[PDB]
Amino acid sequence: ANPLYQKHIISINDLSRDDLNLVLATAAKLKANPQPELLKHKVIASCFFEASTRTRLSFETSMHRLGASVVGFSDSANTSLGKKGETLADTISVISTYVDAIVMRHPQEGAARLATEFSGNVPVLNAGDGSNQHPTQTLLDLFTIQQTQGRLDNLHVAMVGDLKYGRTVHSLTQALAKFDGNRFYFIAPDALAMPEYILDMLDEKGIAWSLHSSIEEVMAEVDILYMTRVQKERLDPSEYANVKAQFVLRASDLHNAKANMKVLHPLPRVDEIATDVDKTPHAWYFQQAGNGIFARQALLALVLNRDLVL
Amino acid sequence: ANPLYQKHIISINDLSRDDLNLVLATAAKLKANPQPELLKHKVIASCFFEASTRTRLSFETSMHRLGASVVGFSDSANTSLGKKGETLADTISVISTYVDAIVMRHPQEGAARLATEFSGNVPVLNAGDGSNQHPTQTLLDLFTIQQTQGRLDNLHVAMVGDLKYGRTVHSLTQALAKFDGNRFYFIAPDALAMPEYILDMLDEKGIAWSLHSSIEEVMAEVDILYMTRVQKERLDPSEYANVKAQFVLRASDLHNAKANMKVLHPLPRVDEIATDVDKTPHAWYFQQAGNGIFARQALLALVLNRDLVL
Amino acid sequence: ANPLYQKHIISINDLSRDDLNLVLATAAKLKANPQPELLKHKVIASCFFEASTRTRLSFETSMHRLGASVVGFSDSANTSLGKKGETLADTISVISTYVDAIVMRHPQEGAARLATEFSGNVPVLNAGDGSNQHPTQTLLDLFTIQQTQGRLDNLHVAMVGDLKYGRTVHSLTQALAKFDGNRFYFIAPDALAMPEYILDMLDEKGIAWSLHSSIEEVMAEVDILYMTRVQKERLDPSEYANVKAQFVLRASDLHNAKANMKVLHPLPRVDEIATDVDKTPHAWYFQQAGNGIFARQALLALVLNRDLVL
Amino acid sequence: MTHDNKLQVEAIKRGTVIDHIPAQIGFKLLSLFKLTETDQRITIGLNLPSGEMGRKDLIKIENTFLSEDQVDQLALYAPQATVNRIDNYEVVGKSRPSLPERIDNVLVCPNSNCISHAEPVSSSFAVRKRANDIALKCKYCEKEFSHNVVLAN
Amino acid sequence: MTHDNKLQVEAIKRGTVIDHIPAQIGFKLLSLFKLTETDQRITIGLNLPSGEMGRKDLIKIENTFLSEDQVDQLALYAPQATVNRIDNYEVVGKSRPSLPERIDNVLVCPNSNCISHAEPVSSSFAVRKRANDIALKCKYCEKEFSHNVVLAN
Ligand SMILES: O=C(O)C[C@H](NC(=O)CP(=O)(O)O)C(=O)O
Numbered sequence A, B, C: 001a002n003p004l005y006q007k008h009i010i011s012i013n014d015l016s017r018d019d020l021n022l023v024l025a026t027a028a029k030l031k032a033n034p035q036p037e038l039l040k041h042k043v044i045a046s047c048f049f050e051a052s053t054r055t056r057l058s059f060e061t062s063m064h065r066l067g068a069s070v071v072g073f074s075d076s077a078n079t080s081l082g083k084k085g086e087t088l089a090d091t092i093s094v095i096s097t098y099v100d101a102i103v104m105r106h107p108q109e110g111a112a113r114l115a116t117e118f119s120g121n122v123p124v125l126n127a128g129d130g131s132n133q134h135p136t137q138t139l140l141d142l143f144t145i146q147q148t149q150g151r152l153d154n155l156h157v158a159m160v161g162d163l164k165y166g167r168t169v170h171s172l173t174q175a176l177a178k179f180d181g182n183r184f185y186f187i188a189p190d191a192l193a194m195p196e197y198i199l200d201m202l203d204e205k206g207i208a209w210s211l212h213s214s215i216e217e218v219m220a221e222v223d224i225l226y227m228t229r230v231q232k233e234r235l236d237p238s239e240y241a242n243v244k245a246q247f248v249l250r251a252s253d254l255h256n257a258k259a260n261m262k263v264l265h266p267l268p269r270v271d272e273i274a275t276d277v278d279k280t281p282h283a284w285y286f287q288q289a290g291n292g293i294f295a296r297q298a299l300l301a302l303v304l305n306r307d308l309v310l
Numbered sequence D, E: 001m002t003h004d005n006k007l008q009v010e011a012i013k014r015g016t017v018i019d020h021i022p023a024q025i026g027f028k029l030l031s032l033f034k035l036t037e038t039d040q041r042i043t044i045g046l047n048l049p050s051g052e053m054g055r056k057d058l059i060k061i062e063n064t065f066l067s068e069d070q071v072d073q074l075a076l077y078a079p080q081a082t083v084n085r086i087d088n089y090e091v092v093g094k095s096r097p098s099l100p101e102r103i104d105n106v107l108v109c110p111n112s113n114c115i116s117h118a119e120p121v122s123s124s125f126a127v128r129k130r131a132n133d134i135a136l137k138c139k140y141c142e143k144e145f146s147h148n149v150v151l152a153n
């Protein structure tokens, strides 16, 4: 039994530093030593109650790359919860009698935690629940930073955009606070700032963070600049002032940047990253997405395989 | 490396006579010598941004008949391009880091060509882009004409219906102009006529074509009568006069027809072919659809297999 | 032929202290001694393309109270302009060939101005155009203000609300800067502040004005507290943050209030003036409204009648 | 009697000669005031040196005659500029765009809810010397905008 | 080397000199070639005559020589143009515009349903002389239009 065996992956806050390390290490192995039938005979429900291109297709692709079968729904509209009034509790209850793991993405914060109280032995994997967490994104981002920085400590990381509704940054900050010496620069409209709950943890850990009103102020320092999309779908109408990207990244502002720096982004990008950045050796968002394949395979292996040997 | 290996299938105009021949020949082989694991271990994205019954399910069925796994979306509504504003360029960019081929059908002319500039080594297969092309339809139609006429030369072919918005006929005319001695009769409302770009090519090749205002005038001559559905979804509102089938085929008008003639149709038919034609030894539209299985298997084999031996 | 005879009443910036004093004295004489046939045989168009309860109704009662007749609309949905695509220009062109005057309210700024260039001889009264002017509101506010303070010169005036889109404050502020010694206080969210053009006209004129963050910060030095509604229907989406009133007048705020201070408001109010205020002695909005009859009968009397009412 | 420094032919019978237009204006004036929509001989010299007026710009329109009305309308872009009236080769007149009190049919009211955008009327603005810049006020909506922000055609 | 034929002529050491620009076309190239940007003593002559040919437009930009494509792109807008490379008050090379095989970026596909509009890509058509008019084929939608229509971008 590996530490991750049959564990629910709901919140980075429930995961430890060595847990995250076993994933990155396994990811690395699969990425060079493909295990085509590691999951032969399993059937995973890929249940997404909210839109997805990357998350769902990477997950489904990983399952297939490992021999799993997949069954599920990409829209809640044609489910019985959609047209018949079924609770989410009962939906998870019956589905868990069919399959081996459940990858779920939902619009309301806490939809994943609630799934666990209703699924028995079936591990639940959080592909995103509202603006709360998205641990799998964070596993693929950590893998992407590791492989380009050769480290997960003492890094200088800037997080730009919607930090408030961004479950991507909520989960990545809690992960990167688990390693040592990392420094954080948060650049976001005041309305969409970093929640206090995460800052307080930082203080409580004695992590060095700070605020800035422009990328220009930090460009020369960061090793990683995590650009984020404004969560239009979640904004309360009073926040409607904040729909257009306040901070936009053009190829020219990467001029004083460290040679080793990589621009990451969870994607989809709208206008926060002008397309001319794409051709700079700094843009790493598409390599970061392909990484979704290797990190999520690793997770399915670790969670459904009592003992992995590669 | 067969000629088709890793090639994008975007437009019949980019394909040659021997290319089309290798497909028909391979089709024929698979249709009698099933290769159950020819594609074991591949994962193909079946991305349809527009409605489909035949094309999508035949494609997906072929992939499975060959051991491939499939991952994808039958509606763009629940994608990130659907609800998050993602460009089609970025959608193709990330998806191509997951899979081996991408079968895509889209509403706008040129959506497939654009996919190639964004997918690297990943071959793109055009399941239809607006009213422009649909090469796979044409491969299954050529297979259907070959197997019933025993030839692809000197045939007399009538094309009836919406010739203007019909990507089906645009691609089939360019294919059948690549063989010798074929003669073309075009029967269509003036508003929905055969584009000039295709006629000019015909002239330029010295192909014999002509126009007629009724099936009655040509019934006794054609070997193949390709009936087409009026593209209601594409009609500009000024063309709204042309929504009802101007030319309808009833079982009685097949009376003076050559014994060897077969009625083909891409389908779905609405009212252009009365259902009593279904029982005549002339109707060949359902046998033509099943043919989708064998021609598209052939294509996936030829494109993903460096060297095929059957 | 009195100064305003056959004149167009489009903006308070085209009138002068004398013109205004002309209207209020007439207002006064009319209130004391009604003239039931003073407009016998005139037919007036009441054309409202935006909503209205007091402007339209007080306007129409006024025409009737003076013997005139009325033709019009209260919604352009069933006008040729609304269902057949007509221009406002043509609309006023045909209308000015039936009636003696056009009283109109419109959703776009400068629509009353436009109509003057096409109404020929018929005068155009502006019952409000978008967020520009509302001159007849201004007339009754002046009349009510003089009624309750004895004068219009040297008054302490606080304007609270949506000062940016309030067409009422634009006019009124311009009207009082035509008198001597008036002092201004402005309390509004920063997004709905008095427009520049008004603050400038003030400076040029040496009028004293200052911003404030609380009604209470002026409660003691004011004679007239002019309350306004957040012109909700005019806000841009990016201003949806100020859709709910920030300054609400409740009775207990009228504690240090000057003995002669009245609360005015052009109505309709939503949450900015609590109902308890209604029964204190400072509330004068419903009397202010009722005074609309007189400012309006007087204006009509003057524009359509040659000699100073005898 | 233009100047000297290596020859080329360049003198006209009658017409107009807007002299002393600063850089990146000349093009703008040809486009806005449509001073190119005519069969007349036009000679636009750009960047051609003129001392204090280091990189001046110049335009010459044959037969064409400006109007006090027109000329003034240039003070919104090239005010210092001098209009030289050349008739029968003799420079007969010489103005300098001063400020007009109203700009018509050229600009476009930045207020998107302005009636001018829908109806078939001609835009029109009152010009005013605000403080630093010139203040433009729409005839219809009554809003005033930095003479710099008001766009045109 | 010499002095030109017709009257009002302008001179230069090194630079490009485009002549024969049909009437009313000179100002436009000045727009869609972004020539006016370069502060190099540009000279322009709208409506000059053109002997038996009529009236002509012409541009002179010192120190500036056209792109490795602009002449080809200048072929569609004004086929009968002449591009003179003038080095040291002399023509060390004269060219005629040739219509290229294909044209990129500058053109906008007239088919509204073409994906080139919506997506971040460069337009590019394939030029093919047809019967008198030239035909352009969109790289993306595969349609071929007459340049009459395409030149409504
Ligand atoms: O939505 C974002 O931009 C960030 C993040 N994006 C993703 O997970 C990528 P995707 O939506 O396609 O699956 C998410 O939280 O959904």
Ligand SMILES: O=C(O)C[C@H](NC(=O)CP(=O)(O)O)C(=O)O
Binding pocket: B051, B052, B053, B054, B055, B056, B128, B134, B137, B167, B168, B229, B266, B267, B268
């Ligand atoms: O739509 C048509 O009738 C012709 C043609 N039909 C098909 O491809 C069959 P289907 O839509 O089910 O996949 C097409 O171009 O979509």
Ligand SMILES: O=C(O)C[C@H](NC(=O)CP(=O)(O)O)C(=O)O
Binding pocket: C051, C052, C053, C054, C055, C056, C128, C134, C137, C166, C167, C168, C228, C229, C231, C266, C267, C268
């Ligand atoms: O609507 C307001 O808040 C103030 C003002 N109100 C009025 O004129 C009263 P009503 O719209 O009922 O005629 C206006 O601008 O319309």
Ligand SMILES: [Zn+2]
Binding pocket: C110, D109, D110, D111, D114, D115, D116, D138, D139, D140, D141, D142, D143
């Ligand atoms: Zn305006």
Ligand SMILES: [Zn+2]
Binding pocket: B110, E109, E110, E111, E114, E115, E116, E138, E139, E140, E141, E142, E143
């Ligand atoms: Zn196109």
